[PDB]
Each structure stands twice: as C-alpha cells, then as structure tokens.
Specification:
Layout lengths: L2 E7 L23 E9 L5 E3 L2 H6 L2 H6 L9 E7 L6 H8 L1 H17 L4 E5 L13 H17 L5 E6 L3 H7 L2 H7 L2 E4 L35 H10 L7 E6 L1 E7 L11 E4 L11 E3 H10 L4 E5 L4 E6 L2 E4 L3 H13 L4 E5 L16 H12 L4
Parallel strand pairs: 1-2, 1-15, 2-4, 4-5, 5-6, 6-7, 7-8, 8-15
Antiparallel strand pairs: 2-3, 9-10, 9-11, 9-14, 12-13, 13-14
PDB class: hydrolase
Keywords: chitinase, Ostrinia furnacalis, group IV, hydrolase
Assembly: monomeric
Length: 375
C-alpha cells in the first residue's frame, strides 16, 4: 500500500520554454495520487476556482482528472488552501456550522462535476498567520474534517490533509489523533525547514542534525527525522503518515563568501531560477541545469544531515538530488511510512536535461519504494 502523492502547482502552465509544465506533462504512472493545487474559499465557505480561465474555461480540472483514462488506478484529488490562500478565511469558515456546511457542499460539487476522487485540505495554518479565532482553530479544524468525512463517505471520496511538520509548529495547529482519525492519510510537509528568512544558511529538508548545529536539545531542531518521529509519537499511525520531500531548493546570499558552510551568516535571499522567478527558491530542474552548465560551483554533501548544498561566491544553495532523495525514501521505508508526498512535480527534471533520465527525483521515489530498501 505504499503511495506516491504528487502535487501539481497548476500555474506552471504559464512558464515559457523549457519551464512550461502542463497537465499533459504529468506521467500518471509515476504517482498513485495526483493533487491539483490549488482551489480556494471565501470566508462564507464557498469553494472556488482561483484561476477560472485555466481551471474551468480551458478545462484544466477535467484534463487533470482525465489522466485516469491513462492510469485507471490513479486517484486525483483537488487541494484547497495553500500558502497564498492564508488562514483568515479558513478560520472564519471553520468556526461557523453554516459556513462549514457550505464548504462541504460546494467542494463536493466541484469534486463531482470535475471527476476528482477527493479533497486535500491545505489550510496554512490553523491558529497561525492571519487566523481570526486563534486557538479555537485547532478544535474547529478537527470538526471540519469529521463533517467532511461524514459527507464524503456517501460518495466513496478521499479526504486528506497537508500539515506543518516540526513539533513546534504542529502543536500550534493540530490535535494529531483527531486529524488522523478522519483522513485517509496525512501529508507532512517535511521541507522548508530553513530558508532565506533565516539569519544563517540552512538546509531545506535536512534528514538529521546539520553541520553547524548544536547537539544539545537535538529534538528541537528543524529536520525531517524530528518531524516524522513527532507525528508518529503523537498518534499518527505509520499507515497514515506520508512523508513530504521537496523537488526544489532554497537560495541564500552569504554575508561573507569565505564562510560557506551550513549555518553561515546570510544576508537574505539568493538567486532565482529562470522560470520560477522567485529569489530564494529554485526548482530542481533549474538548479541541476545551472550546476551542469557552470563548473565553478562547489557541491558538497552535509554528511550529518544527508543533503547536498552548493556555493559560488555569494550564492549558497540548499537542494535535494537523487542521492539525498534515496536517503529520504530509505528512511521512510525504515519506519514503514505509508509513502512519499512531493512538492512539486513541475520542478523535477521532467525533460531529463540533467543527464539522469526524465523525472529523476520522481523515478527515484518510485524505485526505492518498490524495492523496499531501508538503508
């Protein structure tokens, strides 16, 4: 029952040239679950298309779910929420029985009309950011999931969530047993552990302790192992714990280029990829190509954290490659986790321009899960 949960950032269709990634760029046999990111809500709970020209007029919802014509076993979910959607309107919706009912009915209508198999709830986050009702959100989130499950069971539909990873974040938002109870699985967002918002360089998804980190109070550090062990410990059964992995890296401007280890002083966000066009973020497709075309980069492996990083003068980049992806999936196998979730399919090296075949990261996930390697 190992699963591979592929998020698709559907705005990638607007990229140009080799960065453009449409629905028909998806390989429906490299995922078991494919997730359409994102739909949204209003404060009264009405589910809505965030890019109706694409989603509705140009038929993108239906093209996405029509991937089941190629792989009939594929499950196609629609994800509501995401970073840009924020928290306020979800806080408002979840607190009012009438708005929860409206959300259940309107999300169900979109799911059935466009032939989705279920709903992924990505509220970022209960009791955080621009939340309106604060700690009430923790209870109201679990009530929302319970009521979604009750209705969705009439139609055989899936209900999943994406959640913050490390304990310090999770305890702000979730009662873990009540979240796990109603969902088919929990996708733990075990990435964005560190980024250009930090005062020092750090890894986006370190597995264990990183270079430059203190080992005292190790359980408080932001890494994948601490997050997974927290969720398991808090009552998420392994068969409902899907471990997130990133198909992107994060970029930094060093304060002093001669000090370029992990946990070195940083001055802010670094380079942007040509297509993702956001300083501080770079897709794997973009950065593997940058490394291939410029031999001046230095690539190192942090052998504490089991992840690579690269630097060139002021640029310092945390990323994940085939080797570190292998270590991550071996880790998940070793704890009998339900599977792997990835953000996001459109920044794998989907064209195979970096010499390791098309979709090297996604194929790595599928291969290591199929083989069952634990070390």
């Amino acid at each position: 029952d190992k699963i591979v949960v592929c998020y698709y950032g559907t705005w990638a269709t607007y990229r140009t040239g080799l960065g453009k990634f449409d629905v028909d760029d998806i390989d429906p046999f490299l995922c078991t679950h494919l997730v359409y990111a994102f739909i949204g809500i209003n404060a009264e709970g009405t589910a809505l298309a965030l890019d109706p020209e694409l989603d509705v007029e140009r038929g993108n919802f239906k093209q996405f779910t029509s991937l089941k014509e190629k792989n009939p076993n594929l499950k196609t979910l629609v994800a509501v929420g995401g970073w840009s959607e924020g928290s306020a309107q979800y806080s408002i919706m979840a607190a009012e029985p009438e708005y929860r009912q409206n959300f259940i009915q309107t999300s169900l209508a979109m799911i059935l009309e466009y032939n989705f198999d279920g709903l992924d709830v990505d509220w970022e986050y209960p009791n955080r950011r621009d939340t309106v009702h604060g700690e009430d959100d923790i209870e109201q989130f679990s009530t929302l999931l319970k009521e979604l499950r009750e209705e969705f069971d009439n139609y055989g539909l899936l209900l999943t969530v994406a959640v913050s990873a490390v304990e310090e974040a999770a305890v702000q938002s979730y009662d873990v047993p009540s979240v796990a109870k109603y969902v088919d699985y929990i996708g733990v967002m075990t990435y964005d552990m560190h980024g250009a918002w930090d005062s020092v360089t750090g890894h986006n998804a370190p597995l264990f302790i990183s270079e430059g980190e203190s080992a005292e109070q190790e359980s408080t550090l932001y890494n994948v192992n601490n997050a997974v062990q927290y969720w398991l410990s808090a009552g998420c059964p392994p068969e409902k714990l899907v471990m997130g992995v990133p198909f992107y890296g994060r970029t930094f401007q060093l304060s002093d280029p001669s000090v370029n280890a992990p946990n070195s002083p940083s001055n802010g966000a670094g380079l942007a990829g040509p297509y993702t066009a956001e300083s501080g973020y770079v897709g794997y497709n973009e950065f593997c190509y940058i490394l291939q075309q410029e031999s001046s980069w230095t690539v190192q492996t942090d052998n504490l954290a089991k992840v690579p990083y690269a630097f060139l003068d002021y640029n310092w980049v945390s990323f994940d490659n085939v080797e570190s992806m292998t270590a991550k999936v071996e880790y998940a196998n070793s704890f009998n986790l339900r599977g792997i979730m990835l953000w996001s399919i459109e920044t794998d090296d989907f064209h195979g321009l970096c010499g390791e075949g098309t979709f090297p990261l996604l194929n790595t996930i599928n291969t290591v899960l199929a083989e069952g390697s634990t070390e």
